[PDB]
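quick one: calcium ion bound model?
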Amino acid sequence: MQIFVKTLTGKTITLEVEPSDTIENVKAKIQDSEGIPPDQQRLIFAGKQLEDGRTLSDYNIQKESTLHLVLRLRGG
Ligand SMILES: [Ca+2]
Ligand SMILES: [Cl-]
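yep, here:
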């Protein structure tokens, strides 16, 4: 199973994952790849912010699904 993590700046990271992987595990992989701390990452799928303790299967994320990645909105 691969999924795509897509930024709004046109960069897509391809990750190898399992349905039982948690969002924490996915964020850890994004940190390894791009150096973004997990607490700064916002992942969105199905219009939902994905939470660290839930699994890909919890959100019904499928093979070759794309997840949006943006940063946490700071500075307000
Ligand atoms: Ca895995
Ligand atoms: Cl999808």
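The two ends are 38 Å apart (CA to CA).
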